[PDB]
């Protein structure tokens, strides 16, 4: 997956005008757009057709996916239907239910994105014990995609370890978060980043610093 | 605590419009909660929640398994709520932080929380089944009064029921397709919650009419 400058937008802006025209500011920079539920659930799942017409970029639906199995075939059967290319699935309720995203996608002709460990600091709690043994189970199940956290730099190393270089690997918790871009990408293949640019005075200028501090990756 | 029609809960996870409202509009006199998910959200969008208000009576919970981060988690209860949802579905798993953020939510936009503890399938014994408890406690610490627990696993919804107290709200899935018993159920969750033995009955109201008759002194 050829991801732009190793950089995803994402895009959580929560209305349609707002969105699309900051994701065009920064359309030279980065050809990948992560869109979750707080646009969805604002706009309508017709935004990610509206997104691949205006932009022709690649649309990851972070859906953080987490049902039983039977659900899990639904949602990412609508999501797909909507013409995102890849899904965003938690690993935490277990393999039946990863097993039901990858069945749909590969249906569809689309990619499932395994979350292992999540930046926040309450992903401590019960999820960081579970991780490691999370991406062992993503490598027993064939995943080839993962996500992890930017904001524990030992903690994105040890997935990628387990997961291997082959591995396809993205990161959130850049920048608002405390993740630093430069060594996000010593781990991971490209970094996730939302309010650094969305939210920025100037998103353009934003993106373009991110980049310029990572020129050399 | 919300007065559930007859203790159950539809969860309506047909994936188009016609059918969606055609089948729960068959069981209004039997259910007045009905759980509206992605499956049907995705599919037809957040004014579903808008058209089941208008037509039924009923009240909506969108189960939506919120699980993202903290300030993520803010901005899906708010378009939720915003949309006409009387509560949302959270789990627990991702930590006291991000079911706070939910609660904040909630709190400020006058609706309710339900958190997810510990779910129904199969694979939920390999992570979250070990977790389950101490995110219950975390739930009653934290102030949650509404909770979801598994109807497939008898002596586990016993042990939530017991964690969260007599006062709280339980609602559980699982009954019908999963395996769950209907009165078994309703020995420690206040509703239960079926989807596809209604759903995909060749008569959705015959269907909820005879789980019900099955709990009549319940
Ligand atoms: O562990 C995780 C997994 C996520 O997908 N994400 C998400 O990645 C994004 C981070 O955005 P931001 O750069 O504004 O912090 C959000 O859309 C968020 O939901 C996260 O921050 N941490
Ligand atoms: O632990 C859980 C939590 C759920 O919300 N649910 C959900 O409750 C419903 C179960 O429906 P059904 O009766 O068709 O098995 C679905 O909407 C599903 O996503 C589940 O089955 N088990």
Redesign the interface.
């Known amino acids: 997956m050829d991801v732009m400058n190793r950089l995803i937008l994402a895009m ?1 802006l ?1 209305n349609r005008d707002d969105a699309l025209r900051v994701t065009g500011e920064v359309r030279e920079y980065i050809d990948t757009v992560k869109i ?3 646009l ?3 706009e ?2 017709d935004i990610i057709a509206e997104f691949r017409k205006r932009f022709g970029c690649r649309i990851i639906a972070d ?2 996916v ?4 039977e ?1 899990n075939e ?2 990412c ?3 797909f ?2 013409g995102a290319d890849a899904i965003i699935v ?9 097993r039901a995203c990858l069945n749909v996608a590969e249906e569809m002709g689309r990619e499932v994105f395994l979350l292992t460990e ?10 960081q014990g ?1 991780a490691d ?2 991406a062992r ?1 993503g490598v027993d199940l064939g995943v080839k995609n993962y996500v992890g956290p930017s904001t524990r730099p030992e903690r994105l190393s040890r997935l990628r370890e387990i997961i291997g270089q082959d591995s396809f690997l993205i990161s959130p918790g850049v920048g608002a ?1 405390g993740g630093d871009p430069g060594e996000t990408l010593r781990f991971a293949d490209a970094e996730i980043v939302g ?1 650094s640019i969305y939210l920025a005075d100037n998103p353009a200028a934003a993106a373009a610093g991110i980049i310029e501090s990572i020129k050399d990756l």
């Open positions: 959580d929560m979750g539920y707080p969805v659930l604002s309508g799942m859906f953080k987490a049902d039983i199995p659900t639904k949602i059967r609508a999501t239907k909507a938690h690993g935490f309720p277990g393999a039946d239910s990863v999540m930046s926040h600091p309450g992903a401590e709690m019960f999820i579970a043994e999370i189970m978060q309010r």
